[PDB]
Design an enzyme around this catalytic site. Structure first.
Site, PDB file in Angstrom:
ATOM      1  N   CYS A 118       0.176  -7.836   4.570  1.00 18.68           N
ATOM      2  CA  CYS A 118       1.317  -8.534   5.124  1.00 18.68           C
ATOM      3  C   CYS A 118       0.823  -9.551   6.155  1.00 18.68           C
ATOM      4  CB  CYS A 118       2.302  -7.535   5.734  1.00 18.68           C
ATOM      5  SG  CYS A 118       1.518  -6.403   6.913  1.00 18.68           S
TER       6      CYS A 118
ATOM      7  N   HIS B 108       4.150  -6.003  15.519  1.00 15.80           N
ATOM      8  CA  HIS B 108       4.329  -5.541  14.144  1.00 15.80           C
ATOM      9  C   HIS B 108       5.154  -4.256  14.105  1.00 15.80           C
ATOM     10  CE1 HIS B 108       3.292  -4.186  10.092  1.00 15.80           C
ATOM     11  NE2 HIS B 108       2.636  -5.340   9.881  1.00 15.80           N
TER      12      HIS B 108
HETATM   13  N1  LIG Z   1       4.480  -1.236   4.585  1.00 17.30           N
HETATM   14  C1  LIG Z   1       3.995  -2.515   4.826  1.00 17.30           C
HETATM   15  O1  LIG Z   1       4.492  -3.267   5.672  1.00 17.30           O
HETATM   16  C2  LIG Z   1       2.824  -3.049   4.012  1.00 17.30           C
HETATM   17  C3  LIG Z   1       2.596  -4.457   3.927  1.00 17.30           C
HETATM   18  C4  LIG Z   1       1.507  -4.976   3.187  1.00 17.30           C
HETATM   19  C5  LIG Z   1       0.617  -4.079   2.606  1.00 17.30           C
HETATM   20  N2  LIG Z   1       0.868  -2.718   2.704  1.00 17.30           N
HETATM   21  C6  LIG Z   1      -0.039  -1.820   1.982  1.00 17.30           C
HETATM   22  O2  LIG Z   1       0.626  -1.328   0.851  1.00 17.30           O
HETATM   23  C7  LIG Z   1       0.126   0.022   0.484  1.00 17.30           C
HETATM   24  C8  LIG Z   1       1.262   1.056   0.518  1.00 17.30           C
HETATM   25  O3  LIG Z   1       2.063   0.868   1.724  1.00 17.30           O
HETATM   26  P1  LIG Z   1       3.455   1.605   1.900  1.00 17.30           P
HETATM   27  O4  LIG Z   1       4.053   1.106   3.154  1.00 17.30           O
HETATM   28  O5  LIG Z   1       4.161   1.351   0.570  1.00 17.30           O
HETATM   29  O6  LIG Z   1       2.988   3.130   1.906  1.00 17.30           O
HETATM   30  P2  LIG Z   1       4.030   4.356   1.551  1.00 17.30           P
HETATM   31  O7  LIG Z   1       3.478   5.536   2.277  1.00 17.30           O
HETATM   32  O8  LIG Z   1       5.430   4.003   1.781  1.00 17.30           O
HETATM   33  O9  LIG Z   1       3.775   4.546   0.028  1.00 17.30           O
HETATM   34  C9  LIG Z   1       2.579   5.130  -0.434  1.00 17.30           C
HETATM   35  C10 LIG Z   1       3.069   5.790  -1.712  1.00 17.30           C
HETATM   36  O10 LIG Z   1       1.943   6.141  -2.492  1.00 17.30           O
HETATM   37  C11 LIG Z   1       2.128   7.490  -2.943  1.00 17.30           C
HETATM   38  N3  LIG Z   1       0.787   8.026  -3.178  1.00 17.30           N
HETATM   39  C12 LIG Z   1      -0.118   8.398  -2.210  1.00 17.30           C
HETATM   40  N4  LIG Z   1      -1.266   8.804  -2.730  1.00 17.30           N
HETATM   41  C13 LIG Z   1      -1.114   8.662  -4.122  1.00 17.30           C
HETATM   42  C14 LIG Z   1      -1.962   8.907  -5.242  1.00 17.30           C
HETATM   43  N5  LIG Z   1      -3.233   9.408  -5.184  1.00 17.30           N
HETATM   44  N6  LIG Z   1      -1.477   8.656  -6.497  1.00 17.30           N
HETATM   45  C15 LIG Z   1      -0.204   8.171  -6.624  1.00 17.30           C
HETATM   46  N7  LIG Z   1       0.678   7.886  -5.619  1.00 17.30           N
HETATM   47  C16 LIG Z   1       0.157   8.170  -4.387  1.00 17.30           C
HETATM   48  C17 LIG Z   1       2.793   8.171  -1.805  1.00 17.30           C
HETATM   49  O11 LIG Z   1       3.429   9.374  -2.274  1.00 17.30           O
HETATM   50  C18 LIG Z   1       3.789   7.107  -1.367  1.00 17.30           C
HETATM   51  O12 LIG Z   1       5.044   7.179  -2.105  1.00 17.30           O
HETATM   52  C19 LIG Z   1      -0.902   0.348   1.566  1.00 17.30           C
HETATM   53  O13 LIG Z   1      -2.174  -0.108   1.073  1.00 17.30           O
HETATM   54  C20 LIG Z   1      -0.432  -0.557   2.727  1.00 17.30           C
HETATM   55  O14 LIG Z   1      -1.506  -0.873   3.580  1.00 17.30           O
HETATM   56  C21 LIG Z   1       1.925  -2.189   3.401  1.00 17.30           C
END
Ligand SMILES: NC(=O)c1ccc[n+]([C@@H]2O[C@H](COP(=O)([O-])OP(=O)(O)OC[C@H]3O[C@@H](n4cnc5c(N)ncnc54)[C@H](O)[C@@H]3O)[C@@H](O)[C@H]2O)c1
Ligand SMILES: NC(=O)c1ccc[n+]([C@@H]2O[C@H](COP(=O)([O-])OP(=O)(O)OC[C@H]3O[C@@H](n4cnc5c(N)ncnc54)[C@H](O)[C@@H]3O)[C@@H](O)[C@H]2O)c1
Ligand SMILES: NC(=O)c1ccc[n+]([C@@H]2O[C@H](COP(=O)([O-])OP(=O)(O)OC[C@H]3O[C@@H](n4cnc5c(N)ncnc54)[C@H](O)[C@@H]3O)[C@@H](O)[C@H]2O)c1
Ligand SMILES: NC(=O)c1ccc[n+]([C@@H]2O[C@H](COP(=O)([O-])OP(=O)(O)OC[C@H]3O[C@@H](n4cnc5c(N)ncnc54)[C@H](O)[C@@H]3O)[C@@H](O)[C@H]2O)c1
Lengths: 336, 336, 336, 336
Positions: A154, A181
């Site tokens: 992000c 953030h």
């Molecule tokens: N939330 C933000 O603002 C944002 C912005 C840009 C990038 N990101 C990146 O996006 C990715 C996810 O972020 P998020 O906010 O969606 O996290 P989140 O915790 O909301 O979602 C992670 C999901 O992955 C699932 N999961 C975890 N381990 C798993 C596995 N081995 N196999 C299958 N599913 C699995 C979890 O159950 C969960 O539903 C991360 O790399 C984060 O750094 C997040």
């Protein structure tokens, strides 16, 4: 092009929403399957109801092994190891949107290639041995050859368009970033042991200002190669559930005024890089579809003698701005 | 020296608390009377119970016209115009701690001098036609002659010790500040018309990141005259009820490392200027008694070629850090 | 009596704090060792700094395998299976305070008895095949014979003293409870998959009112046997990080007035059951040491014809009220 | 029918939004003018951008004396005394939607009748010497004769449909209500003097559970005359910015089961009274257009011997549910 979403988290779900709500405009792609660690019942519920982005304007339900949207079925798996998800054979998955946070490198995300998927786009920084694409800044570097690609973070998406504009218009000598953030799910609801053991990550997220490391500025050279080695910065995590803002303080190669800076950056306005002078605040940012929303009202150029500092500021819906960027890259990726 | 507190708000009440809890160490001064716009019943209740700073460890009650602490009575008035509060004749008030936010200039705070008070210390910036004192930085400028004096703002107190140290050790060419700051009672609980009409001030405070103007950096020359014209900055108001942090990005006259910066600033450590390397977050800052708490863990020096930016960061309990500073100045003021 | 704390979470840490701060009054007991899933560095940091209960007024640090408080060392283990923690042989642990949330039954908490510990007090409801003790209500049921004992829940401790008083003074025919309760670490920071899969537990905790199940009222007969089968209720989880309130609506056997109810309940006032008429709110409750704080200002008796409903309300610091109760039981347990 | 909105607060603005977004369905009425205490610039900004209800999907701006939506002008006044607002002569105002909170009685709201307006609908309880209308429950009592009418409160609207259903299906002997309710602008952002002087109203709203008085249950007889004298209750104000829930505990005239209660209440489902079994939480309630959203998942019937208590629970968007109700009444009012 058949898409499997690995990790139906905030990003995975919002990507599902954005793809569907683009309708005609996302014709080349369609989500066919999903993998997570939980029940279809829960995945369907969380797609439907979102505390920050509101209720999805579709009919959602589950079966014993799928979610159902407006009548169409999407298969759900609970496979912790990616090379084990059988969605190529079962569902014809061509392409993985990797959004678990657990496969953020080329080596790891090869697991999907072992599973028989052809391409992966990773919803996070995943190192320097692949391309990182910020749509609107270097998506022309993308080819059909590429197998595993990063969409950056992000913050990367918030920062790159602003620094791109500054670099091309004035030149950046050096700069330092602070992003104020929203909290994310890497943080703790209340103080307690946190994965990785960080003393600050461990602190209650919705009741503290919490300093955080970020490599977004440091790694910007992967997206804007000219600024390699020129930037650094950090984050302050604060109690909003979504909605973020990136400040950059630069030494530029030319003497500027705020107005000149604002005027130059407006030349770069695009679906990816918005320009918003309406005196907004973070909750107005929620749902915005640009990767970065430049805020000219926050521009400040501070001068003493021959020395000048330039502060520029962009908003971003860390969840949805990023997601819409990923989807832009996904649509281009598909058009190859 | 008999003190009247005008405005038993957050600052007025905490000053009452701090004076009492200094005990012996605040012998030269004692609060004798209070003025506000409300009942003694409510003033007593709010002194006793505080949502952010906890319950006052004393017995508090009210009569029809006073609050009572541990048996001692303090007269309460509800006089909107300061020249009308009769606490000189009634209570022997010598000295006003002006904390209403409504008398923030020499002209206005003359109203207390008309009321017969001898001195005023104002809990806020009050212009350039009087002295602004940051204890630990320029309290040696203070004399017995001075009638109406400013204690600056919370942000001034957070910033001045840090820039003082940097100026004396390395020299500052130019700098820009962002303070990530708790919400305050100038803001709105929910979106709606706000005094002054500012489009951002009008927004719900506990659910937004809200950019805010601040003159703390711009006016720093009143406290550290060498940095006149060298600094500017702004604020981001975020959803914590107290607890704030000031970042400064400088061009210095010398090439430095983070470690050198940290080492130099530690030389200035004092009751007024703390140095805290324990990886704290905002809620740990609550109750700290220094005006500014330097955080060496956030120091970052970013260099490309011959160009270098230096980011330094200090915490502050905007309410209580400031209050304890005001009380230090008050105690010195009295010792004159 | 040498105590091992299993789970240095909110409860485990606060119990450590309370035991130490009782000083002389906790002479029969001392914490000697701790088990969790994380580094001594982090455990020490979280004991020292607490977002809700403030900074511990002691010197805390870590070694490679212990935390250190005021110079004394406490061994730290990271053993996921309790029969594997070697703190009997290593540290002379006599007694386990079980606070992980993962051993909430007699069968499970036998693991510590296999490890060689003599007694367990469990920081939670743990079924009906052992005793549940609410100090101030049925601690006289406790004997030296007992090996594994439950301290109930925070809600049990909030409810039992109030219903005990009502039952003994008027008689309860039937009643229903709603506790408006702080969020806890079983909840989610942002919407996403939650252990157990509950559609409401999955929702962002600090931005929603979230209905929650609780067996506190239903299981009250384990503590107050006369009210077996007479009570039920539920919870609403709301966005405060600590601080909770329990409302009970009863049909009593006698016609009462609010004043009569208040007067009768005040007869039961104790270190365990406070009576507070000062018009407090949840943040004033933080740090209170009673298990339940009756609030007579909320009493309401509603009558139409021959039918009458009685609403009574008690506050509780779900973390610290409960902890202090557990410590009372622990001290009694030890005196046996 | 030409409508003047007095008080462009949360309710006044949302009513403007709802009327416009009904389009064709609000043909008989149109807002022509607005009165408040502030600039058109600010009123336009707050209509456009809302921290809880999102950005209005129209083009909004201001002139020196009006707001402009999609090209149409709406006159803005800043007249503190209602008999002074000249919008009858200037703007042809027929009808006042009184939403300031400062005219909540027949006597006071006569000021608009003196100003030359024909009818007033007041966005709040305004006493017993006029009608209080909950649409869907007693809007058939409304005639063209009525000059000044009350739309009750948000809580009245949440409660009346539920008790109406219970009274008609089973009969209510007596009942007591607790509403867990969002904070509102009568509360304080941080602890400090509050209009009216209430010791609880004075407390920081977004960091406390705060008990509050409410006459909604007590005054229900104005809407459902059979339940006159049968109900009472109170509120707990909690830290959400919008979104509320009303629990009622009844003795009914018949023995029931939860399922029977749920089934009977579903018979009353309407645009005004929703029935929602999807396990929602408060943020899902935002934007719902029913006055009351019955939640059968929270129904609980507690029985011991011959004694039975029935708990029923309805959600409501205190801002928008209420507003949509007011608009329903307004549309009916106009059709007369
Ligand atoms: N939330 C933000 O603002 C944002 C912005 C840009 C990038 N990101 C990146 O996006 C990715 C996810 O972020 P998020 O906010 O969606 O996290 P989140 O915790 O909301 O979602 C992670 C999901 O992955 C699932 N999961 C975890 N381990 C798993 C596995 N081995 N196999 C299958 N599913 C699995 C979890 O159950 C969960 O539903 C991360 O790399 C984060 O750094 C997040
Ligand atoms: N809150 C902070 O973090 C902070 C820090 C540094 C400086 N300040 C400054 O301190 C001053 C007060 O801040 P606050 O946070 O205590 O505000 P506050 O709103 O909590 O207190 C203001 C008090 O003054 C009373 N008051 C208002 N008008 C009055 C009048 N005419 N006569 C008498 N009493 C009157 C109000 O009733 C209220 O109790 C302001 O100048 C503010 O800028 C605040
Ligand atoms: N927080 C409250 O208000 C409250 C009140 C009364 C009762 N309780 C009960 O107290 C218990 C703990 O609550 P909490 O709020 O302290 O939880 P917490 O999450 O803060 O602490 C749980 C701790 O246990 C550790 N842990 C988890 N699994 C472990 C294992 N196998 N071995 C060793 N350590 C392990 C975790 O790392 C964590 O530090 C739960 O049973 C809870 O229901 C909580
Ligand atoms: N917010 C809710 O959930 C809710 C629900 C139902 C009923 N209500 C009732 O609706 C009314 C307004 O509530 P709100 O939440 O919109 O309040 P608000 O504070 O958001 O709005 C009040 C508006 O009235 C304006 N105003 C105040 N005095 C005025 C005067 N003399 N002349 C003209 N304008 C004046 C204020 O500037 C403000 O914009 C109150 O009676 C409230 O009890 C509120």
């Amino acid at each position: 092009v058949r898409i499997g979403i690995n990790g139906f988290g905030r990003i995975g779900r919002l990507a599902f929403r954005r793809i569907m709500d683009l309708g005609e405009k996302s014709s080349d792609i369609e989500v066919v399957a999903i993998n997570d660690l939980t029940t279809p019942a829960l995945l369907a519920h969380l797609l439907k109801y979102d505390s920050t982005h509101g209720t999805f304007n579709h009919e959602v339900s589950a079966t014993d092994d799928s979610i159902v949207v407006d009548g169409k079925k999407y298969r759900v798996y609970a496979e912790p190891q990616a090379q084990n998800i059988p969605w190529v054979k079962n569902d014809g998955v061509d392409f993985v949107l990797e959004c678990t946070g657990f496969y953020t490198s080329k080596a790891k995300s090869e697991a999907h290639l072992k599973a028989g998927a052809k391409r992966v786009l990773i919803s996070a920084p995943a190192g320097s041995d692949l391309k990182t694409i910020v749509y609107g800044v270097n998506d022309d570097t993308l080819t059909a050859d590429d197998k595993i690609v990063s969409a950056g973070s992000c913050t990367t998406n918030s920062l790159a368009p602003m620094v791109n504009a500054l670099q091309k218009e004035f030149g950046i000598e050096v700069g330092t970033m602070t992003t104020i953030h929203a909290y994310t799910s890497t943080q703790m609801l209340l103080d307690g042991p946190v994965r990785g053991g960080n003393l600050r990550s461990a602190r209650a997220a919705a009741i503290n200002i919490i300093p955080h490391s970020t490599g977004a500025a440091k790694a910007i050279g992967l997206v804007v190669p000219e600024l390699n080695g020129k930037l650094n910065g950090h984050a302050q995590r604060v109690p909003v559930p979504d909605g973020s803002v990136t400040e950059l303080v630069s030494i530029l190669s030319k003497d500027v005024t705020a107005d000149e800076v604002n005027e130059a950056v407006k030349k770069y306005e695009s679906p990816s890089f918005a320009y918003n002078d309406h005196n907004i605040v973070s909750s107005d940012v929620l749902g915005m579809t640009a990767g970065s929303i430049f805020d000219p009202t926050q521009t400040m150029v501070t001068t003493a003698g021959d020395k000048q500092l330039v502060k520029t500021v962009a908003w971003y819906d860390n969840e949805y701005s990023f997601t819409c960027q990923m989807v832009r890259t996904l649509l281009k990726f598909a058009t190859l």
